[PDB]
Design a protein around this ligand. Structure first.
Ligand SMILES: *[C@@H]1O[C@H](CO)[C@@H](O[C@@H]2O[C@H](CO)[C@@H](O[C@@H]3O[C@H](CO[C@H]4O[C@H](CO[C@H]5O[C@H](CO)[C@@H](O)[C@H](O)[C@@H]5O[C@H]5O[C@H](CO)[C@@H](O)[C@H](O)[C@@H]5O)[C@@H](O)[C@H](O[C@H]5O[C@H](CO)[C@@H](O)[C@H](O)[C@@H]5O)[C@@H]4O)[C@@H](O)[C@H](O[C@H]4O[C@H](CO)[C@@H](O)[C@H](O)[C@@H]4O[C@H]4O[C@H](CO)[C@@H](O)[C@H](O)[C@@H]4O[C@H]4O[C@H](CO)[C@@H](O)[C@H](O)[C@@H]4O)[C@@H]3O)[C@H](O)[C@H]2NC(C)=O)[C@H](O)[C@H]1NC(C)=O
Ligand SMILES: *[C@@H]1O[C@H](CO)[C@@H](O[C@@H]2O[C@H](CO)[C@@H](O[C@@H]3O[C@H](CO[C@H]4O[C@H](CO)[C@@H](O)[C@H](O)[C@@H]4O)[C@@H](O)[C@H](O[C@H]4O[C@H](CO)[C@@H](O)[C@H](O)[C@@H]4O)[C@@H]3O)[C@H](O)[C@H]2NC(C)=O)[C@H](O)[C@H]1NC(C)=O
Ligand SMILES: *[C@@H]1O[C@H](CO)[C@@H](O[C@@H]2O[C@H](CO)[C@@H](O[C@@H]3O[C@H](CO)[C@@H](O)[C@H](O[C@H]4O[C@H](CO)[C@@H](O)[C@H](O)[C@@H]4O)[C@@H]3O)[C@H](O)[C@H]2NC(C)=O)[C@H](O)[C@H]1NC(C)=O
Ligand SMILES: *[C@@H]1O[C@H](CO)[C@@H](O[C@@H]2O[C@H](CO)[C@@H](O[C@@H]3O[C@H](CO[C@H]4O[C@H](CO)[C@@H](O)[C@H](O)[C@@H]4O)[C@@H](O)[C@H](O)[C@@H]3O)[C@H](O)[C@H]2NC(C)=O)[C@H](O)[C@H]1NC(C)=O
Ligand SMILES: *[C@@H]1O[C@H](CO)[C@@H](O[C@@H]2O[C@H](CO)[C@@H](O)[C@H](O)[C@H]2NC(C)=O)[C@H](O)[C@H]1NC(C)=O
Ligand SMILES: *[C@@H]1O[C@H](CO)[C@@H](O[C@@H]2O[C@H](CO)[C@@H](O)[C@H](O)[C@H]2NC(C)=O)[C@H](O)[C@H]1NC(C)=O
Ligand SMILES: *[C@@H]1O[C@H](CO)[C@@H](O)[C@H](O)[C@H]1NC(C)=O
Ligand SMILES: *[C@@H]1O[C@H](CO)[C@@H](O)[C@H](O)[C@H]1NC(C)=O
Ligand SMILES: *[C@@H]1O[C@H](CO)[C@@H](O)[C@H](O)[C@H]1NC(C)=O
Lengths: 212, 215, 338, 167
């Protein structure tokens, strides 16, 4: 059972750039039976290259292949809007077909610090029997950011879930939510709730917080 | 040309069985077109389920006995049809399933390799949600305060929900985040708008048209 | 070792140089002698795909038969659109001979030997030959005459069974003899005799086969809803004369049917050309008995496809596309480049 | 693509193949019932209600054009017609109207229209008196001659004319 691992997990590229996306198999594939797909968000994946380097009919010539033993790579010249998305490599050398982790080719942009907003639980939710504290990071680059929920200056694990928007068509930025889900009781049993976000664009750890 | 049209969304409970079907319009015969089933869990990559080729059914060892892949050829009333059946459904089968097809006529085409191939034509995909949760409406709460303000859509099922602001009047600065599967098998999301106001939530499966103010 | 490829073929027959029959004449000038020691090599462990609807062989045969009918059956008065062309119209002896289609060097023909091969899909029994079998260039409509018989089952072949507009070839296993005659001493009046027993029997067997291709629906047979006489009637050339038989009786679910069926045939001088958009007039029919006894080896059908209800299905005869006639003989062949 | 036609008239629908040659084509209705196609160089007509009153110009088949002519239109002929030519699946919406007065006091012009229509009828009287309405136009006096009446559907106008009498 062959494993395909891609590199990198994600890369930032500009329009016109040449993107190199590699992929490696747990064993050698002599037949060069590897394919490259692209996937638009919410849409089915399109087949771009087959048998290592063979470019499928209807697909732009800017897509190129390279195949050598265990290491394969997709080369995309003169990159363009439609090219941005997630690319996958697949092996069909032996049963069964196996896919790679995927690679998110995303628009590079000037690094932008995040905008932090903290939201206490609404009163009607509190009366519903649950409390959800919501820390929000507005538009920022890169997506890569870490956010912790310190309650009474004490770290908290579990009971937390964050979510991310797709890159804005115009801002080419991301917006991220983080929600701490507690009971009403546990919310009354603690005094201060804090959201600490750490980002390369922040240059300083930010703690937006409240007490109630 | 070819257009693989798949069945509608299936929301089934654990342990049950689901059968989906792929209508391979534009396909002359599955004798020249192999059909491969590939699923994709939400936020995950693609995993090959199984296939039918030369009218011989097969599945990845990952799905032995749990999966049934069948297909009938072109008739006077309908195109070639393929079908995937899955028994003992779990929460780890909550993936979007794809019916894909590929021509195997040219034996020396790079597409295929003795039953193992790439996937040329892709269907629309069909989502199967496996959860013990019974369909439920969302509780909607206002998250009130350059400034940020948003509505919390919580504990709804199944997906999806459509959230608006000022009934579509406000479109800039708004970020409606994708639903998160809470630890309670229910879904929840939020929509935040940046302003220096109402939420419009529509969960069609629950018939709930909740519109709630914020301030 | 090989790939599918479109090259130019060459004919091969056993035509005799002294023969006056035009097919023989054309063949002696356009084609070579047959192989006296034809050899066929069975490709063991080889599975090859076939698509009888995309076979360039057919197209090339079409071109030969057109040229042959052009040299051999020149009309007295040819009317294409508005142009009127007068040329000699001598009565000739006209009995189709078998034509083998062969591949040049570097190429070879793959022959599917599967017993009930519908023409499209993989062939688990592939063979290799230098030429095809002897195919008579019989030009007909509604009924395929003097063709090859299916070994074991009635076979149903269509480019697209869903598309009602796509013709349905019916390959029979048992031939149904049709004895068409213009009596000696309306010179333009004739008839085709068919043993009602055999036809009814065969016709039931093809209903069953249609059922298995069309959802066990009820199979109804009808005369053609309309169009040219060449299409609405069983059209075929006998001794140079263009026959038109009325096949209304043959295509209806009436089965005292053990009777003999007598089809009303007419010999026409003025016809629509199948070769292309054009109309042709030939001289009045020859004197004396004119008898062609042919073997009905296939049927050309066309499903209505109302697509409104599953209560029933209706089939009518047609088949103006003569490439479907060659297709019905060439389905088991493909040309590949070594 | 939508076209209209008077009841009892002749309409010609366009089908143009990409190639300048005769390829198998076929005209079907919305219910997928064959109307008019070709086999080789021969013409064939489907079991449709227009088996007569349907023809084509074989002349243009070589040029790659396969017209569907429907002469002497009826109201029932109103339907969507499809020209399949191998890759092309062109579609066209045909609508047919027939305007009839109550007889050969008051007058009423009943516009015989197909279902799922949005009739828009305006009639210009002698002395240019204009009247608008739906499938029915009415008048209560008598002014009596070659009245002319246009119908509007999908931004396409079709002109009718009717003659009347007096006492
Ligand atoms: C031109 O000529 C050509 C040839 O001359 C001609 O080709 C022929 O095409 C037809 C199709 O039209 C072919 O017939 C079809 O064959 C299909 C496949 O059949 C094989 O595979 C199945 C399933 O295989 C799994 O199960 C068995 C256990 O018995 C295992 O042992 C197998 O290994 C396999 O399991 C593997 O795969 C699993 C997942 O896939 C894995 O989990 C597992 O680990 C393994 O990897 C077998 O059951 C079949 O065997 C049976 O028949 C043989 C005899 O041939 C017996 O020996 C054997 O004992 C079995 O009884 C076989 O091996 C069939 O799927 C297909 O059947 C459909 O059509 C018929 C009607 O004709 C229906 O009655 C039937 O129900 C099937 O319809 C289903 O699918 C349609 C469309 O999807 C649905 O609309 C319909 O509702 C129906 O679904 C129902 O059943 C589903 C369960 O099956 C269920 O999920 C649904 O919910 C629903 O209830 C059909 O028979 C034929 O073989 C070709 N001929 C040749 C010679 O190859 C071509 O058509 C011609 N073209 C034209 C235009 O004329
Ligand atoms: C044998 O004969 C049959 C005749 O039916 C052919 O079957 C048709 O095959 C074609 C294949 O393209 C089909 O045409 C496509 O239909 C699509 C939708 O089909 C159904 O679904 C919708 C609702 O979703 C219905 O409204 C509709 O009436 C149909 O019932 C269209 O969506 C397709 O257009 C889309 O596809 C292409 C991408 O391929 C896009 O570029 C277009 O923008 C558009 O999105 C297309 O029209 C047709 O539906 C089939 N059957 C019908 C009408 O009965 C077979 O093709 C033929 N066999 C072969 C080998 O061709
Ligand atoms: C379908 O196949 C059948 C046969 O299976 C075929 O019927 C055959 O017709 C031919 C020609 O009509 C017959 O052969 C002729 O028999 C007549 C008898 O009247 C002879 O006169 C003919 O020879 C004369 O002409 C020759 C010149 O070509 C001279 O050399 C010769 O001296 C004679 O003057 C000729 O032998 C044949 O017998 C029948 N076959 C059978 C079994 O009845 C039918 O025409 C085919 N139909 C189609 C559409 O292909
Ligand atoms: C081949 O010969 C056939 C007859 O052997 C021809 O069929 C005839 O075609 C004409 C065309 O006008 C039809 O005439 C019409 O008949 C109908 C009545 O049809 C219904 O009732 C009769 C009983 O009389 C019944 O037999 C039918 O099945 C129908 O149920 C009239 O309503 C019309 O006004 C008109 O007179 C003949 O009916 C039809 N004969 C038969 C037996 O169907 C055929 O046209 C010839 N083919 C060619 C190309 O010339
Ligand atoms: C083919 O059909 C013709 C036409 O029916 C048959 O001709 C008959 O031949 C016999 C002598 O053999 C005559 O007595 C008859 O008068 C002929 N009948 C007619 C109508 O011409 C001929 O027998 C048939 N051949 C067969 C069935 O093999
Ligand atoms: C158009 O076809 C209609 C068919 O209705 C013809 O109408 C018939 O015509 C005769 C008189 O010619 C009447 O006696 C019938 O009662 C009519 N039958 C029906 C069903 O209306 C009409 O003559 C044809 N008109 C043209 C211009 O061809
Ligand atoms: C269904 O799957 C589970 C594996 O988690 C297994 O324990 C169970 O036995 C399966 N059902 C049956 C009937 O075997
Ligand atoms: C396979 O082909 C050979 C000739 O190539 C023939 O003798 C044999 O009968 C065929 N077998 C079947 C099942 O058609
Ligand atoms: C219908 O056809 C199926 C298989 O095609 C067969 O099992 C069944 O017995 C048939 N039923 C009838 C009434 O012909």
């Amino acid at each position: 059972d062959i494993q395909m691992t891609q590199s990198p997990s994600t890369l930032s590229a500009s329009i016109g750039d040449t993107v190199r996306i590699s992929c490696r198999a747990s064993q050698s594939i002599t037949g060069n039976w590897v394919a490259w797909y692209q996937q638009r968000p919410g849409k089915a994946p399109r087949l771009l290259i087959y048998r290592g380097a063979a470019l499928l009919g209807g697909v732009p010539s800017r897509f190129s292949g390279s195949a050598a033993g265990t290491d394969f790579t997709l080369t995309i010249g003169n990159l363009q809007a439609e090219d941005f998305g997630t690319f996958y490599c697949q092996q069909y050398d032996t049963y069964p077909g196996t896919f790679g982790q995927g690679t998110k080719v995303e628009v590079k942009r000037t690094v932008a610090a995040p905008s932090v907003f903290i939201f206490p639980p609404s009163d009607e939710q509190l009366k519903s029997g649950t409390a959800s504290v919501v820390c929000l990071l507005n538009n920022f680059y890169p997506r890569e950011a870490k956010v912790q929920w310190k309650v009474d200056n004490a770290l908290q694990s579990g009971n937390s879930q964050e979510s991310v928007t797709e890159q804005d068509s115009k801002d080419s930025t991301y917006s991220l939510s983080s929600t701490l889900t507690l009971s009403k009781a546990d919310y009354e049993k603690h005094k201060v709730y804090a959201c600490e976000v750490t980002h390369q664009g922040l240059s300083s750890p930010v703690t937006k917080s409240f007490n109630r | 040309q070819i257009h693989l049209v798949q069945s509608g969304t299936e929301v089934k409970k654990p342990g049950s069985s689901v059968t989906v079907s792929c209508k391979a319009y534009g396909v002359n015969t599955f004798g020249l077109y192999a059909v491969n089933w590939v699923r994709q869990a939400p936020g995950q990559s693609l995993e090959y389920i199984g296939q039918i080729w030369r009218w011989k059914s097969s599945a990845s060892h990952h799905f032995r006995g749990r999966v049934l892949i069948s297909a009938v050829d072109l008739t006077g009333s309908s195109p070639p049809i393929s079908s995937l059946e899955i028994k003992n459904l779990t929460s780890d089968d909550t993936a979007v399933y794809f019916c894909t097809t590929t021509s195997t006529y040219d034996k020396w085409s790079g597409l295929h390799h003795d039953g193992v191939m790439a996937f040329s034509s892709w269907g629309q995909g069909t989502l199967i949600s496996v959860s013990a949760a019974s369909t439920k409406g969302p509780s909607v709460f206002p998250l009130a305060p350059t400034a940020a303000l948003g509505c919390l859509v919580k504990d709804y099922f199944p997906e999806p929900v459509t959230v608006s602001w000022n009934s579509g009047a406000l479109t800039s600065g708004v970020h409606t985040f994708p639903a998160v599967l809470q630890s309670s098998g229910l879904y929840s999301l939020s929509s935040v708008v940046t302003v220096p106001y109402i939420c419009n939530v529509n969960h069609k499966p629950s018939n709930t048209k909740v519109d709630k103010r914020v301030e | 070792v090989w790939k599918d490829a479109d090259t130019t073929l060459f004919c091969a027959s056993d035509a005799k140089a002294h023969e006056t029959e035009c097919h023989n004449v054309w063949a002696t000038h356009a084609c070579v002698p047959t192989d006296p020691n034809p050899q066929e090599i069975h490709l063991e462990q080889v599975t090859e795909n076939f698509n009888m609807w995309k076979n360039n062989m057919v197209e090339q045969m079409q071109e030969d038969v057109i040229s042959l009918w052009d040299q051999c059956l020149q009309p007295c008065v040819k009317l294409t659109g508005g142009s009127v062309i007068k040329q000699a119209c001598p009565k000739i002896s006209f009995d189709p001979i078998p034509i083998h289609y062969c591949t040049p060097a570097g190429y070879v023909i793959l022959k599917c030997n599967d017993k009930n091969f519908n023409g499209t899909g993989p062939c688990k029994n592939v063979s290799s030959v230098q030429c095809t079998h002897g195919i008579k260039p019989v030009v007909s409509t509604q009924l395929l005459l003097n063709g090859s018989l299916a070994e074991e089952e009635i076979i149903i072949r269509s480019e697209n069974l869903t598309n009602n507009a796509k013709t349905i070839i019916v390959h029979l296993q048992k031939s149904v003899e049709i004895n068409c005659t213009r009596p000696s001493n309306d010179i333009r009046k004739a008839y085709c005799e068919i043993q009602g027993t055999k036809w009814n029997k065969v016709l039931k067997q093809v209903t069953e086969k249609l059922k298995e291709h069309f959802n066990n629906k009820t199979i109804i047979f009808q005369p053609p809803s309309g169009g040219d006489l060449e299409i609405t009637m069983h059209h075929f050339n006998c001794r140079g004369e263009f026959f038109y038989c009325n096949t209304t009786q043959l295509f209806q679910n009436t089965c005292g049917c053990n009777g003999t069926i007598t089809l009303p045939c007419k010999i026409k001088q003025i016809i629509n050309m199948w070769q292309g958009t054009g109309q042709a007039m030939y001289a009045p029919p020859i004197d004396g008995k004119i008898n062609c006894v042919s073997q009905i080896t296939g049927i050309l059908l066309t499903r209505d496809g109302g697509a409104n209800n599953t209560s029933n299905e209706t089939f009518r005869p047609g088949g103006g596309n003569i490439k479907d006639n060659w297709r019905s003989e060439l389905y088991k062949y493909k040309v590949v480049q070594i | 693509k939508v076209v209209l036609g008077k009841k009892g008239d002749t309409v010609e629908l366009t089908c143009t193949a990409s190639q300048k040659k005769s390829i198998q084509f076929h005209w079907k209705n919305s219910n997928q019932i064959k109307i008019l196609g070709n086999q080789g160089s021969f013409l064939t007509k489907g079991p449709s209600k227009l088996n007569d009153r349907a023809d084509s110009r074989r002349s243009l088949w070589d040029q790659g054009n396969f017209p569907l002519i429907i002469k002497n239109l009826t109201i029932e002929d109103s339907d969507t017609y499809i020209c399949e030519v191998e890759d092309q699946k062109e579609e066209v919406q045909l609508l047919v109207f027939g305007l009839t007065a109550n007889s050969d006091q008051s007058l009423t012009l009943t516009l015989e229209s197909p279902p799922g229509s949005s009739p828009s009828v305006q009639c210009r009287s002698p002395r240019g008196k204009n009247i608008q309405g739906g499938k029915t136009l009415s008048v209560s006096q008598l002014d009596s001659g070659t009245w002319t009446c246009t119908v509007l559907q999908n931004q396409k106008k079709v002109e009718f004319k009717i003659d009347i009498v007096v006492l």
